[PDB]
């Protein structure tokens, strides 16, 4: 039954027990229920007034940590003889939570998530001699998924009629935006057991309703006579979080961001056929006190 | 008292005598879609006893080096009975499921099955970065076989798979498992031919063993849809 739990529960004292018909330490794993044997029923306990709060394991606290989701370095220079596969003073990024594995395993502890995401953008610059670091203006434009993204630094898509842009400088504090809960469903599917199109040639596991959008970031300045290397780090913090149906954590290393494929490490720990590193026997104690 | 159980849905009934207390998934029971959560505005068809009835699948042979079996829902039932005809003639779909898994043997046999229902079991492939295709996922009535059930074929773990709605068939205790599933989706209804809400996984955690005469031990799966709605009537694909 649902109740409000602010601290961990208290222990009551117990006595010698010797009753027929009552066996609280015996259980039934086969029902799928966890054992309800209390510590008062297994040993003799004392009264403990437990004042240990439980507020740090709240799902709001467990997930609302600003985590790196994007890291992109591009050369900020005059791009005339640069190849067309490079970032000519701007980049595009489809917003995902799959690329960096600390937030990914943490969000994949749940099947469904409903959250607002606040987005911190940290820009840092390095000289590509030394003459000083420029205080450049960057534009981060939020483009929805599948819409027209800019193809140039100076394209006319950067004018942002209805697309939300943030203009920010390197010497400022980092730019911070709140992106709302933007799914067309009532929760994001962290896992999607399906195909996202009506044909049999779509992608497995990728629901585009889960995708936030594109993040097109340019430098508004023109090129200086020297080049610079600009690294843009994007940080996501979930907030106002509801979470449903928890899952086993991922044990094997991630291979891709598109799928849940697995290889495992070559030896234990976290190998395919051995998640926990090995000991000599089942009656061998690894860190035995001498 | 909790070992005997008759499940009566439609014209189908199942009596069992060697069962456990059955599992309702996440404490929830199936229901129809209420008006304050509805999206599709046309009147749904609720065929009830024509579709809310047990559907028994093909049995699987529990053998020596079995790794496990999985069926995806509603994909395992999309071509069976009047459930499959309502699936193929409609665009939308909403139901829960009453899964009953049967496996018995003698009192000289040993073995344990983990009968676990997994929501949104997105699978992974082994030793490649190409995603699984359509035919790897949409098996249908026959279902599939686990390749690496120790990581649940998705890089996670079988050990922590008791966080999902599950039971056990330990052959010295029970011979059946029963899991009642509600609707488990982010959307209130769904297109049943491209998305699976539940995967029934049956996994040999303790293998089958005896020293008496060798009999075939089958594992039978009966699935009853519960509270079926169908929206978006058209032709059949």
């Amino acid at each position: 039954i649902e109740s409000i739990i602010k601290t961990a529960t208290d222990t009551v004292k117990s006595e010698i027990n010797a009753e027929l018909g009552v066996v609280p330490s015996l259980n039934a794993v086969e029902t799928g229920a966890t054992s309800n044997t209390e510590p008062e029923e297994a040993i003799q306990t004392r009264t403990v007034i437990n004042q240990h709060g439980v507020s740090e394991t709240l799902v709001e606290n467990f997930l609302s940590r600003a985590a790196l989701v994007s890291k992109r370095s591009f050369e900020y220079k005059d791009h005339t003889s640069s190849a067309a596969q490079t970032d000519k003073n701007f980049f595009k990024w489809t917003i995902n939570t799959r690329s960096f594995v600390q937030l990914r395993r943490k969000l994949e502890l749940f099947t469904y998530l409903r959250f607002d995401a606040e987005i911190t953008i940290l820009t840092t610059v390095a000289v590509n001699t030394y003459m000083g670091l420029p205080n450049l203006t960057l534009q981060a434009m939020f483009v929805p998924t599948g819409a027209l993204t800019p193809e140039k630094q100076d394209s006319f898509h950067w004018q942002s009629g209805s697309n939300a842009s943030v203009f920010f400088k390197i010497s400022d504090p980092p730019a911070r935006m709140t992106i709302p809960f933007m799914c067309i469903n009532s929760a994001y599917s962290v896992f999607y057991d399906g195909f996202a199109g009506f044909e049999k040639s779509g992608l497995y596991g990728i629901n585009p309703a889960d995708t936030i959008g594109n993040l097109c970031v340019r430098i508004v300045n023109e090129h200086q006579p020297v080049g610079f290397t600009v690294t843009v780090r994007v940080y996501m913090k979930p907030k106002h979080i509801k979470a449903w149906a928890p899952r086993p954590p991922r044990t094997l290393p991630y291979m891709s961001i598109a799928n849940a494929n697995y290889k495992g490490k070559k030896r234990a720990p976290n190998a395919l056929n051995a998640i926990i590193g090995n000991r000599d026997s089942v009656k061998t104690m690894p860190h035995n006190i001498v | 008292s909790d070992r005997v159980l008759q499940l009566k849905l439609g014209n189908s009934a199942i009596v069992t005598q060697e069962a456990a207390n059955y599992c309702c998934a996440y404490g929830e029971w199936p229901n129809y879609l209420p008006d304050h959560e509805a999206v599709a505005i046309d009147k749904p068809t609720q065929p009830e006893t024509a579709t809310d009835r047990f559907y028994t699948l093909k049995s699987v042979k529990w053998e020596a080096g079995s790794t496990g079996w999985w069926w995806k829902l509603p994909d395992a039932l999309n071509n069976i009975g009047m459930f499959g005809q309502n699936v193929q003639h409609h665009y939308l779909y909403r139901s829960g499921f009453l899964i009953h898994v049967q496996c018995n043997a003698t009192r000289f046999h040993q073995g344990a099955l983990l009968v676990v229902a997994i929501p949104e079991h997105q699978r992974g492939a082994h030793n490649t970065n190409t995603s699984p295709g359509f035919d790897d996922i949409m098996k249908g009535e026959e279902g599939g076989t686990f390749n690496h059930p120790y990581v649940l074929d998705d890089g996670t773990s079988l050990a922590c798979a008791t966080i999902f709605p599950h039971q056990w068939i330990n052959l010295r205790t029970n011979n059946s498992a029963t899991i009642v599933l509600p609707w488990m989706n982010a959307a209130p209804m769904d297109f049943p031919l491209r998305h699976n809400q539940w995967t029934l996984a049956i996994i040999p955690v303790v293998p089958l063993g005896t020293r008496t005469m060798s009999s075939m031990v089958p594992i039978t799966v009966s699935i009853a849809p519960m509270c079926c709605e169908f929206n978006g009537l058209r032709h059949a694909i």
């Binding site: 709302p180 907030k239 | 309702c24 404490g27």
Partner: peptide, 30 residues
Amino acid sequence: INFYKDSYAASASKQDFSQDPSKFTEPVVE
């Protein structure tokens, strides 16, 4: 401190102390 006109702009809501472990630990019916 929320001077924005949208409700999702607010800070994190760390006051949800409602638990129900019995939907995972005792999901059996009887």
